[PDB]
Write a protein that binds this ligand. Structure first.
Ligand SMILES: [Mg+2]
Ligand SMILES: [Mg+2]
Ligand SMILES: [Mg+2]
Ligand SMILES: [Mg+2]
Ligand SMILES: [Mg+2]
Ligand SMILES: [Mg+2]
Ligand SMILES: [Mg+2]
Ligand SMILES: [Mg+2]
Ligand SMILES: [Mg+2]
Ligand SMILES: [Mg+2]
Ligand SMILES: [Mg+2]
Ligand SMILES: [Mg+2]
Ligand SMILES: [Mg+2]
Ligand SMILES: [Mg+2]
Ligand SMILES: [Mn+2]
Ligand SMILES: [Mn+2]
Ligand SMILES: [Mn+2]
Ligand SMILES: [Mn+2]
Ligand SMILES: [Mn+2]
Ligand SMILES: [Mn+2]
Ligand SMILES: [Mn+2]
Ligand SMILES: [Mn+2]
Ligand SMILES: [Mn+2]
Ligand SMILES: [Mn+2]
Ligand SMILES: [Mn+2]
Ligand SMILES: [Mn+2]
Ligand SMILES: [Mn+2]
Ligand SMILES: [Mn+2]
Ligand SMILES: [Mn+2]
Ligand SMILES: [Mn+2]
Ligand SMILES: [Mn+2]
Ligand SMILES: [Mn+2]
Ligand SMILES: [Mn+2]
Ligand SMILES: [Mn+2]
Ligand SMILES: [Mn+2]
Ligand SMILES: [Mn+2]
Ligand SMILES: [Mn+2]
Ligand SMILES: [Mn+2]
Ligand SMILES: [Mn+2]
Ligand SMILES: [Mn+2]
Ligand SMILES: [Mn+2]
Ligand SMILES: [Mn+2]
Ligand SMILES: [Mn+2]
Ligand SMILES: [Mn+2]
Ligand SMILES: [Mn+2]
Ligand SMILES: [Mn+2]
Ligand SMILES: [Mn+2]
Ligand SMILES: [Mn+2]
Ligand SMILES: [Mn+2]
Ligand SMILES: [Mn+2]
Ligand SMILES: [Mn+2]
Ligand SMILES: [Mn+2]
Ligand SMILES: [Mn+2]
Ligand SMILES: [Mn+2]
Ligand SMILES: [Mn+2]
Ligand SMILES: [Mn+2]
Ligand SMILES: [Mn+2]
Ligand SMILES: [Mn+2]
Ligand SMILES: [Mn+2]
Ligand SMILES: [Mn+2]
Ligand SMILES: [Mn+2]
Ligand SMILES: [Mn+2]
Ligand SMILES: [Mn+2]
Ligand SMILES: [Mn+2]
Ligand SMILES: [Mn+2]
Ligand SMILES: [Mn+2]
Lengths: 44, 89, 269
RNA sequence: UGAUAUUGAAAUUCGGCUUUCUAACCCGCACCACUUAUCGUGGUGGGAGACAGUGUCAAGCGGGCAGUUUGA
RNA sequence: UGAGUAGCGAAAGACGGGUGAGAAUCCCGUCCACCGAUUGACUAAGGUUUCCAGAGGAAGGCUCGUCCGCUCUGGGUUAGUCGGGUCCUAAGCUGAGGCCGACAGGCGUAGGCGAUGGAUAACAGGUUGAUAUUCCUGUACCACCUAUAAUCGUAUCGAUGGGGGGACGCAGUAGGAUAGGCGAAGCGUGCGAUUGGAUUGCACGUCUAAGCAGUAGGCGAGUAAUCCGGUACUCGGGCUGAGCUGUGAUGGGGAGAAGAGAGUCGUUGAUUUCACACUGCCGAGAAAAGCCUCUAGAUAGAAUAGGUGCCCGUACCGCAAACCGACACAGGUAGUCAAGAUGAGAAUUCUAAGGUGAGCGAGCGAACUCUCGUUAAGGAACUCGGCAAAAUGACCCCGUAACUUCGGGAGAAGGGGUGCUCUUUAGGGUUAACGCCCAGAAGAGCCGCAGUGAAUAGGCCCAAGCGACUGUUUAUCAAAAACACAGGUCUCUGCUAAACCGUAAGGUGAUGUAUAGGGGCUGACGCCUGCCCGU
RNA sequence: CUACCCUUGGUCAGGUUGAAGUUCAGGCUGAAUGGAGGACCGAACCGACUUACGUUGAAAAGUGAGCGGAUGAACU
């Protein structure tokens, strides 16, 4: 039984990392939102 | 500078096993080269060269009650000399 | 055209081409190396029109379809066999010493003569422009544009007729039976192309087609109504609606797809 | 599919109909140059031509796709 | 409340001696037992201190706990030469200008990023409580610098530029090596206390990089930004690679036992390790750099010591109690190594190396349920249905039907042998025969109920429907008669092709061009496939 | 996770059958070499046909026993 989620740091940091976040308009918006709530952690 | 590149002398039985075989364990600032550690080892101590081994240490962990947390990273590099004899108690 | 013995129940009917014509040099010349990675998908990664994918790797031939280096005489080095094109194609080395891959018309000995351009040597071998070549010439590899490299006849077995000469452009009969005036500045290679019998080799086994870029195709009569016009209904079912339909709707059993008010409509009959 | 702007010149039947030429417009071709680049920009050379393409309006086709009705 | 109820997560332990306030559970000891193509050895992911030592026992541990992957204190990861960076490119990502776009932004040339691949210069031994191709003992290599220069001076570096090379698929056979395996006639030890024996008992039988030497494979003279490339006319064996062995590394290290400075042989089998090499096959099997060149252009001149060589990773777990599954969970997790007997084997049973005894137990030996084994006579009478269980089983020989698309059906059905001893004795290879392998054939003779005496190895036949077949499918109630399939036919489509995505460019189709490409229907093959012009 | 696909790698013990081609005796037949195939037994590995167990589970799809494919439309 192979569950969903087989971790891999490269792919985790891709699509979910600070850079990939900043690269799109919407990721900047996401970062804005997370920063607005005041999350102790933003992007991975 | 060079006074900043060295940090603190390191005392452990492993460090002592190193002093017994002409090797001196030495905490260092981060981003410093093994080279800058030799330069500093000279300008600070008037002894020189041979090998200057270096390793990194990930920050550890410790709790203080409710507040668990990490320590600072280490950058300890031992240095061994072609000639000289650093010590002070 | 070899006929395989029915040793295995699968593909007992098989027919490989008797590639003795391939003769000289199995390996391809290193003159043509770069590309192509396979891609059934379009750019942007969506599956644009396909029952395509998979298949064996193919290095790209860089055949000199243009015959742009017209002039110096050249002779065949070898006959070979291109995968990316149906026909096997011969190599031909220039007197300059430069070598080039050229499509190989039926016949064609291990040594051969005719070059390109200007000269009127209408007897097999490489293309000559344009208004030239006798009417009724065996004619192939026609260009739709001057110096364009000869877009028309290629494939394996292929043909064309050189009948007619209306001025400005020369008339020609395509293997489809179309008869239209290609411009008379066209390159046009002489004889019938490639293998005469590429079409006679039945594939035999399943997946030999999958050795080619051929994914299996699911009929529209099955599936589900959201997937297809033919979809749905209990059991095996009739087309139902009049005129059998392609996915995305639209009739597909005899409906002309040629564009209204085409630019080349004047130049064909 | 039609009127109409882009959109020109010149010849025939009665402003329409059918041909010809380019200064429009167009090449998912040849050459040059930017440039050690199949993108692009020009430059020529052909190709094609006032149509094609595009905007505006108009008439069809259109369960491909959408919102829905389908009584007590 | 249910209730002191269900449960306490596959598994073999017993005792003795320690420790301690307290032991079924901790440590030590003997024996016993389990895995041993693995429950061992090494690593990649991923996890991030779980690693180590000393202390602790409230909680975590499905019991206990003196113990821990838990707690407190202190400490552990050392590299020019290993993996990655200072090297190269693929898919893809990004994309200066640029083309498109209501905006937001999409697309894209040059160029850049990007390993899962190409290229890349060290080995062996030693050592700690925790590291080691990283520390050090020894012996090497690569780059660079600086000091001496035999030989060249309007030789030497050669391009981001054309050359060459790197540069490749899939299958199959034989052979050369090499590791590891097996037995003896040197070599360390012991010599039995249960009847017997003493050429008898067990254990071992090495050494690396580089660096010297030598070995199955592959194949010229001269003329037309360059003397190389390519192209063609006369003229009869050595250029490239290369496993591995001999030597020197070494008078070193390594080693077996024990009484407080020691051996390197011989025969034998023999790889999936060393060649995409070779051969055969068609489905026709990456790119770029390092490297070698030839010039374009640069620059005075380009074996013996000293010295220089950075950043990241390095602990520990990694078929698991430390990874993904909420758990110290019977599931999932790439790769490498893989010994003995038996065998065709990586099957089978028992054992090496090495690991483990499974985080509740003591009793009793009721029903009932589970997992095993056996059962008189009968033998499908059971049941929706032979479901389940039985029976079949290896190897050598003999013998095999209807049918057939001649391949097949076929292990058809089925028939016989199989153990140990002793003789004559005959093939294979290896070697001067000797002996070493492996392995038949005949004859007598022995013992048991039974001889592939264990474990592991096909039940078969008759007839019908459906589908030709291998294959695919509803992850988690349907594997089929469903989809696919090769074959067939219809239809579109002349190349900015049709069809298709975005209709914006751009792109698939396709670097293809009617022997091609899209769609519909059918679905091997055989014999065919008729009657009828509202939509 | 999963479905297709694009690059780039890796795995598949062992036994068996004997296509073409080639070679001697033949006017397309016996013997040898030869090594084909979505070929045949059968581990690794991949699957899920039957059954039993499990059903407030060891487990939100499993376990035992048998079963299908295993050089390929293979597995990853
Ligand atoms: Mg190395
Ligand atoms: Mg890179
Ligand atoms: Mg294991
Ligand atoms: Mg446990
Ligand atoms: Mg054996
Ligand atoms: Mg224990
Ligand atoms: Mg009990
Ligand atoms: Mg029995
Ligand atoms: Mg019935
Ligand atoms: Mg027989
Ligand atoms: Mg038989
Ligand atoms: Mg019936
Ligand atoms: Mg499945
Ligand atoms: Mg377009
Ligand atoms: Mn939050
Ligand atoms: Mn960070
Ligand atoms: Mn380091
Ligand atoms: Mn359906
Ligand atoms: Mn529909
Ligand atoms: Mn229908
Ligand atoms: Mn019906
Ligand atoms: Mn509707
Ligand atoms: Mn509404
Ligand atoms: Mn009602
Ligand atoms: Mn009780
Ligand atoms: Mn109790
Ligand atoms: Mn009760
Ligand atoms: Mn009870
Ligand atoms: Mn109980
Ligand atoms: Mn337990
Ligand atoms: Mn005890
Ligand atoms: Mn005591
Ligand atoms: Mn013990
Ligand atoms: Mn520990
Ligand atoms: Mn407890
Ligand atoms: Mn490196
Ligand atoms: Mn780009
Ligand atoms: Mn821009
Ligand atoms: Mn690019
Ligand atoms: Mn790599
Ligand atoms: Mn360790
Ligand atoms: Mn004894
Ligand atoms: Mn005695
Ligand atoms: Mn380690
Ligand atoms: Mn769970
Ligand atoms: Mn587990
Ligand atoms: Mn697996
Ligand atoms: Mn074995
Ligand atoms: Mn086993
Ligand atoms: Mn052991
Ligand atoms: Mn009975
Ligand atoms: Mn009986
Ligand atoms: Mn009976
Ligand atoms: Mn019966
Ligand atoms: Mn009954
Ligand atoms: Mn009955
Ligand atoms: Mn049964
Ligand atoms: Mn039989
Ligand atoms: Mn079937
Ligand atoms: Mn299902
Ligand atoms: Mn099922
Ligand atoms: Mn748009
Ligand atoms: Mn098979
Ligand atoms: Mn099951
Ligand atoms: Mn099973
Ligand atoms: Mn099988």
């Amino acid at each position: 039984v192979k569950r969903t989620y087989q971790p891999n740091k490269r792919k985790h940091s891709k699509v979910h990392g600070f850079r990939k976040r900043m690269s799109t308009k919407n990721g900047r918006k996401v970062l804005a939102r997370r920063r607005r709530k005041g999350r102790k952690v933003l992007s991975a | 500078e060079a006074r900043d590149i060295l940090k603190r002398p390191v005392i452990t039985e492993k460090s002592s096993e190193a002093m017994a075989e002409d090797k001196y364990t030495f905490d260092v600032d981060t981003r410093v080269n093994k080279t800058q550690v030799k330069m500093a080892v000279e300008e600070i101590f008037n002894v020189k060269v041979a090998s200057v081994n270096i390793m990194n240490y990930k920050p550890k962990k410790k709790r203080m009650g409710r507040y668990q947390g990490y320590t600072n990273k280490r950058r300890k590099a031992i240095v061994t000399l072609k000639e000289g004899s650093i010590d002070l108690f | 055209i070899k006929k395989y013995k029915p040793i295995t129940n699968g593909r007992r009917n098989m027919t490989s081409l008797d590639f003795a014509e391939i003769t000289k040099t199995t390996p391809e010349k290193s003159l043509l190396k770069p590309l192509p990675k396979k891609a059934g998908r379009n750019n942007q990664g969506k599956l644009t029109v396909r029952h395509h994918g998979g298949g064996h790797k193919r290095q790209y031939r860089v055949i000199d379809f243009k015959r742009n280096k017209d002039g110096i005489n050249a002779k065949v080095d070898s006959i070979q066999y291109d995968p990316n094109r149906s026909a096997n194609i011969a190599l031909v080395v220039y007197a300059d010493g430069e070598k080039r891959y050229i499509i190989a018309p039926k016949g064609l000995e291990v040594g051969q003569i005719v070059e390109s351009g200007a000269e009127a040597d209408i007897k097999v071998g490489n293309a000559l422009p344009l208004q030239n070549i006798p009417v009724g010439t065996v004619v192939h590899n026609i260009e739709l544009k001057p110096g364009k490299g000869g877009q028309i006849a290629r494939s394996a077995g292929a043909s064309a007729q050189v009948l007619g000469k209306e001025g400005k452009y020369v008339l020609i009969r395509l293997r489809s039976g179309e008869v239209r005036m290609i411009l008379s500045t066209c390159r046009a290679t002489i004889g019938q192309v490639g293998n005469l019998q590429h079409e006679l080799v039945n594939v035999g086994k399943a997946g030999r087609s999958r050795w080619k870029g051929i994914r299996p195709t699911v009929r529209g009569s099955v599936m589900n109504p959201n997937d297809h016009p033919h979809g749905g209904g209990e059991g095996r079912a009739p087309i139902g609606r009049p005129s059998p339909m392609s996915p995305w709707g639209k009739p597909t059993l005899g409906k002309k797809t040629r564009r209204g008010k085409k630019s080349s409509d004047k130049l064909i009959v």
